[PDB]
């Protein structure tokens, strides 16, 4: 019994966590152009989405990294919602629907 499984039959999950976490995760530059020793030591492949990208050295320690992660997650979720809600109604109205103020930068003046 399980609450998850593969999408393509029996024995199809094959989750590879050693590609996004740990010391063997993929970085923002290929292995030829950047060695793994140039990565900021604070970025140790623990948080999700850690590509080891911090050219300005803005992650001084763990607390700043956590605060910036919280800000990034909030901004990311708001960005998904905003992108969807800014692209979809305009296409709906352009394809033949009756929507007022379809464009995102003009819907405020509608009311």
């Amino acid at each position: 019994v399980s609450r998850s499984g593969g999408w393509l039959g029996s024995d199809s999950q094959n989750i590879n966590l050693d590609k996004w976490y740990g010391p063997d995760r993929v970085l923002y530059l290929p292995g030829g152009l950047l060695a793994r020793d140039e990565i900021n030591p604070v970025l140790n492949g623990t948080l999700p989405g850690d590509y080891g990208y911090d050219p300005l050295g803005l992650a001084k320690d763990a607390e700043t990294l956590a605060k910036y992660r919280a800000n990034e997650l909030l901004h990311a979720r708001w960005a998904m919602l905003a992108a969807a809600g800014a692209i979809i109604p305009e296409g709906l109205a352009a394809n033949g629907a009756d929507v007022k103020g379809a464009t995102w930068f003009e819907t405020g003046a509608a009311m």
Partner: peptide
């Protein structure tokens, strides 16, 4: 075809649930 194969074999929503009354998801 994919969803019926999920129903009779188990997929994203479960692997060992009931055949007729799986529940859960």
């Amino acid at each position: 075809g994919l969803i019926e194969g999920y129903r009779v074999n188990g997929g994203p929503a479960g692997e060992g649930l009931d055949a007729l009354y799986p529940g859960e998801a």
